[PDB]
Structure 1
Amino acid sequence: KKVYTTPKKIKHKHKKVKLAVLSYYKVDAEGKVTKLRRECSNPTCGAGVFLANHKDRLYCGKCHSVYKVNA
């Protein structure tokens, strides 16, 4: 045939990171629980899922992409 070329630099993938995440759930000196990071209000995800915090950003994750409430 011919076989092989490339200007090199092979595309990686997606690491998806690790994290021991959902630490955000602050409970004080026994045993009161006030959550951290405000949650979404779309009836598909009944206020269990929360919102990411970037700049200008309160983003809904479970809503795979959708709905952009902001404050």
Structure 2
Amino acid sequence: VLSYYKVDAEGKVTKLRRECSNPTCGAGVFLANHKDRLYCGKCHSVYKVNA
């Protein structure tokens, strides 16, 4: 239950909740929307400059 799919008609999908440009990962781990911060969960402090 992670309802951030953003699937449209046409059979096109793009990703809600813009995700991490993590060097550790292949850009699959999703960031996390808080106030004054968007937060990575795998590397639990990476890429935190505000929205």
TM-score (norm 1): 0.60
Task: Provide the rounded CA distance (Å) in 1 between the counterparts of 2:14 and 2:37.
Answer: 21
**Contact 2:22–2:46 under 8 Å retained in 1:** no
Task: Show structure 2 runs of 5+ residues with no match.
Answer: none
Q: Which has the higher helix share?
A: 2
Tell me how far 1:69 sits from its aligned partner: 2.9
Tell me how far 1:57 sits from its aligned partner: 1.5
Tell me how far 1:39 sits from its aligned partner: 0.6
Task: Provide the rounded CA distance (Å) in 1 between the counterparts of 2:28 and 2:16.
Answer: 12
> Which structure ranks higher in relative contact order (CA pairs < 8 Å, sequence separation ≥ 6)?
2
Identity %: 100
- Larger Rg: 1 or 2? 1
TM-score (norm 2): 0.78
Tell me how far 1:47 sits from its aligned partner: 1.0
RMSD: 1.5
Q: Aligned pair count?
A: 51
Q: Following superposition, which runs of at least 4 residues in structure 1 exceed 2 angstroms of deviation? A: 64-67
Task: Provide the rounded CA distance (Å) in 2 between the counterparts of 1:34 and 1:67.
Answer: 21
